[model samples]
Target: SGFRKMAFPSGKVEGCMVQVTCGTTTLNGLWLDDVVYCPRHVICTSEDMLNPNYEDLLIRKSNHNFLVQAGNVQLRVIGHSMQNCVLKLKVDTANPKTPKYKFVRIQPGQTFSVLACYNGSPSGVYQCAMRPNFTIKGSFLNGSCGSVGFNIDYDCVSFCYMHHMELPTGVHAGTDLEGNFYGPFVDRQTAQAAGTDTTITVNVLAWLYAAVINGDRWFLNRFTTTLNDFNLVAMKYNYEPLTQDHVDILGPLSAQTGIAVLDMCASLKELLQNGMNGRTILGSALLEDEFTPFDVVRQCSGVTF
Candidate 1:
């Protein structure tokens, strides 16, 4: 009668389901669902996932087997591939000359479907924030370098979308949203161009491009709104301590939310003026023998057309 499962050392499982009767047997504990009953779930070191209620982050794919740590790196099966599609997290509409930032809100498009990580991916799935913010950790298993010493097992699906793209540094592979992949993100041209595009992917239309004048190589850390990455991902997404109607309609990001989302992607420069933040790999290909599993990934690699 061996079937006792209860793990979550100090990461206390989260959402629900707990039953332990150690006295003479009976054990079954479960966690990792919260996002309000699993809505667009995929968290990876985003701080126990919170602030999700606007129609449940739009419910893209609901959820998957997560664990996406940061910098120190730790990827699993993000978006885990099943038609995989992800990229949802918005904020970036601040005013008053950028008063620092605290959060983001609203309810636009809303038609999500979460989960992905294919032989590559399609229309969604992308994350490798390379987190590990400790004395400088972003180690995607040593950033997946040289003859594939260690694949993307170090998932980091914090979140990002609408705009972001790069990969010139080197040791590249990348695959997360839930299916897990990992890579080697070192690209040290001294950080030159650090990152690019094609589909002709070369795009960067900034609806307000006044930040990265010298900050290349970084797909996203929560579309970043500064404030040290909004308090270091300040616990992912933006809803808050159990919602006060989100402080009466977005007014309590310390009172100045919005500025984390695609403040301006403008898909190259137009299309309502925002959306499409990253992409660039100079049209590459995949391994068929980097020691095996070379599923597929032609031309554009995974493409974000």
Candidate 2:
């Protein structure tokens, strides 16, 4: 008598069947069309047995979760509410001069993902958000700051370049309007007294104005072209001359005492007028000066406009 009967824990089992065999006496047929009989009993149900309502099951598992894997660079999604949300991954390569990025979409429970790399390594910072429209509930991963998981509000798409400026003797180092600090470079008065020339001082002063006051902070690192060299580049490319524009922009700063923007512009024009050699001379003066741009500009006393 190798016979058995089975029952479901919940939900009336439907479209299910079973088979049993004992000493070549085998019986195989639907077990539960409202009745059931079996030997060596086994039970199987539809794929949606536990969650009879597929839509409700999806809704129940739709919450979002994220994690950074062991390498501190792997992006993993622990959960995704709705299983239908798509993600876009944006990356910055850490070059202020030129930044690059990419986008990707991931489904719920996605894992073991690596960010797209540039020039041989992963981007310095990355962000992941749902699309076709990104909302506040997105993840921001910063290699420098650390990773933040999903559903957190953060600015993950913008890049900031930190610029460090040297301060003068009397001027104390302090934060700018945008909260960047400028600092204690060599004492310009001392350097000048020790034989540094005014030509060198003037050029350095202009660099500070361009970088700090004018908000062209990148100028400090890349503004190495001579006035003549700039003119040559402009002429060769048939571009508008910047000398007049320089004067127009800087002339107003003449309101500051001890340093006249118009005067510097005039000197710049004179240097440009001489063509190659004049530009080279000015360039030489700037390159030879040991004082940083910030300190040189600060030497121009009472000129704080």
Candidate 3:
């Protein structure tokens, strides 16, 4: 029993055991002598904090922008409910001396949007931008926060801007909505030139006439529902002679003065210039960019090849 006398319980049993839990009640864990500690409710990021089942179902996003001035990290709830939901967070930084973290327990009618993160209070406070990628894990209190759409997000869209490196002889862009190819222009310049006032006003009129003549529901009722949707529906349906109210709300979806055509081409050329700045050749796949946080973390530490 000399080992028992020397033994120091540091509270690491690794699962649901006496006086401890890991997001579930029925699951049981084994406890060796002097190893298991009381239910202090301490959740470690590397161990018991992760819930993998809800990982796939949840829609979580963080608009990351690396900078020195920094930003806020958070767990944002989008709906009602949330009488009981919990979250644990960790941000691995350059300095192990200052660990960044946060713990949150959601209340009924929780009025706040941010729970845990870097810049503001009640978040994992991360000071500098030159750091490693942080992580967050979630659990439910009595039940689940799914009813309130519990999830995560971060503020600071300023640095979230993505410069899509590489260009092709082709330029294509448009949402793939309702299972249809929206575009494949002759060229990007041609696409912009085609988007001029003449094309919009004339084609819109013709399209509206055709839709009305054919009594097309899809062509008529698309993008409908909300208040803006009302105006959007009118603009989509009758571009020729729309209701004044809808027109006021969503008129002139396209069509600018002659000066706009000149400006548009100039702007398009400028947009392409950004791609050239980050490449060996104009928009080549050979990009001049830094490694990711994960990549950088592993490189010097023998974790990366």
lDDT values, one for every candidate: 0.21, 0.26, 0.20
Q: Between the candidate structures 2 and 3, which one is better when assessed by lDDT? A: 2
Q: How far off is residue 68 in model 1, in Å?
A: 15
Q: Point out the worst 10-residue segment of candidate 3 by lDDT.
A: 1-10
Residue-by-residue lDDT tens digits, candidate 2, 4-94 = 1111111111112222222222222112112212211111123443224434534433212122121123322233221111111122212
| Tens-digit lDDT track of model 1 for 196-296 | 21111101111011112213223233232332333222223221121233223222221222333222221112221222334321111210011000111
| Colliding residue pairs in candidate 3 | 117-123, 117-124
Q: In model 2, which runs have C-alpha deviations exceeding 4 angstroms?
A: 1-72, 77-87, 90-205, 208-259, 276-305
Model 3, 86-160: lDDT tens per residue?
A: 222112222112212122332111111111111111211111111111111121222111111111222111110
Top lDDT prediction, candidate number: 2
> Which is the winner by TM-score between candidate 2 and candidate 3?
2
- The order of the candidates by lDDT, greatest first, is 2, 1, 3
